[PDB]
Amino acid sequence: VGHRRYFTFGGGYVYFEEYAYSHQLSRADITTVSTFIDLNITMLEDHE
Amino acid sequence: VERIKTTSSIEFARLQFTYNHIQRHVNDMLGRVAIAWCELQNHELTLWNEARKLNPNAIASVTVGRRVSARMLGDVMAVSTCVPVAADNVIVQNS
Amino acid sequence: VERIKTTSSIEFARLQFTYNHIQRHVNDMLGRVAIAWCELQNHELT
Numbered sequence: 001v002g003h004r005r006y007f008t009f010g011g012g013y014v015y016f017e018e019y020a021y022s023h024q025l026s027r028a029d030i031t032t033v034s035t036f037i038d039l040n041i042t043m044l045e046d047h048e
Numbered sequence: 049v050e051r052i053k054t055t056s057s058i059e060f061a062r063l064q065f066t067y068n069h070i071q072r073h074v075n076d077m078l079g080r081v082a083i084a085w086c087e088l089q090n091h092e093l094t095l096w097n098e099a100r101k102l103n104p105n106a107i108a109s110v111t112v113g114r115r116v117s118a119r120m121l122g123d124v125m126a127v128s129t130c131v132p133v134a135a136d137n138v139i140v141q142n143s
Numbered sequence: 144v145e146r147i148k149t150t151s152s153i154e155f156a157r158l159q160f161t162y163n164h165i166q167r168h169v170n171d172m173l174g175r176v177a178i179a180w181c182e183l184q185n186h187e188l189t
Contacts, residue, residue: 006121013124034111035092039082041079043078048064
């Protein structure tokens, strides 16, 4: 009961409810959390 | 037709060479570091997927940035913030 | 009342500027690297 699922499908997801197709979702329609750790390494600019 | 005038200090050009040499080196090396760091992040994403399948609570808490209960909904996580409880308000049964 | 005396070599100050510029850059970048490395370690602990 209450079977909500999002499955990766192509470039986005295919949201399912109660074991029935609901609609496709764009990839950005779902909030994104980052497992990456930003290392903002910019470059020593040329100096004359 | 003209006459050129020459400075009396190579040290401007020697500084230019030293700075450019050091800059080439450090820019190249920090670029390699950043590239390898991106590759490390993309590479660790697989381990993160496996872990989030294993213990979704801990991974979601770390990634979102706060203690949150989580469970997978296929290929996405459903989160819900957990209510903090004061330490003094917890009692352990002996057995 | 006095008279100031000026050196004949800016190269001390130009070295100071070059060294300080490079040091700011490398200290900032290695600090970012160390911070990201700590975050990576704490993050991999899971």
